[PDB]
């Protein structure tokens, strides 16, 4: 009764990407970022920016013709954070509320088996 895409929320610190693609993932649809919807150089990760980007992506999705999305959310992962950014929740807010249907919330944050010795040195960032 519906047609399935993939939400591909990439909510890092300093930015949140909303990337809705086909079920395969090779073909992209309306890849929108928070920096596209705010120009301050510090609010790209803000919940308002993420919400506006997700609303635009949902409008473009409902103009292409995709109705429901399996949601794959991730942080930077790798070696840096492992923690989803503040804007992912707002982006999913907008995706759910803009008429798109939501399915299979999933965390695809990349987690290593103690690889890629972390950036910052053994004494870390000294602020």
């Amino acid at each position: 009764s519906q047609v399935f895409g993939v939400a591909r929320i990439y909510a890092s610190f300093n930015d949140t990407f909303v990337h809705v693609t086909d079920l395969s993932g090779k073909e992209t649809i309306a890849r929108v970022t928070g920096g596209m919807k705010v120009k301050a150089d510090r609010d790209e990760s803000s919940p308002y920016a993420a919400m506006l980007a997700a609303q635009d992506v949902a409008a473009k999705c409902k103009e292409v013709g995709i109705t429901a999305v399996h949601v794959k959310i991730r942080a930077t992962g790798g070696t840096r954070t492992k923690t989803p950014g503040p804007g992912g929740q707002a982006a999913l807010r907008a995706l759910a509320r803009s008429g798109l249907r939501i399915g299979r919330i999933e965390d695809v944050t990349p987690v290593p088996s103690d690889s890629t010795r972390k950036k910052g040195g053994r004494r870390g960032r000294r602020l």
């Binding site: 999913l92 509320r97 919330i105 004494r123 870390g124």
Partner: protein, 97 residues
């Protein structure tokens, strides 16, 4: 003098424990010394469980939970208030609050 009865870590009979990196500042930490907190916060609460369940195409969806073990150096743990400076007698209290 000696501030803590054993040490500011948990190591008796080992000598060396392989190190870990602070999640917040990336400082190298002994694994037993690092403040370890398991975050089992749900993937999407966002005051939005109702919205997500309504937009869900899955009945009784039972949205999943994200697990993440955070390791802090004591400086970052104090600064972000995972741990707090306790009284001299209250330091001898290992039960969680």
């Amino acid at each position: 003098p000696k501030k803590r009865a054993s040490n500011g870590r948990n190591k008796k009979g080992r000598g060396h424990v392989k190190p870990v990196r602070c999640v917040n500042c990336s400082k190298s930490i002994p694994k037993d010394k690092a403040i370890k907190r398991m975050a089992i916060r749900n993937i999407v609460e966002a005051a939005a469980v109702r919205d997500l369940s309504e937009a869900s195409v899955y009945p009784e969806y039972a949205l999943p939970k994200t697990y993440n073990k955070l390791h802090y150096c004591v400086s970052c743990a104090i600064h972000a208030r995972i741990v707090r400076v306790r009284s001299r007698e209250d330091r001898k209290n290992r039960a969680p609050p």
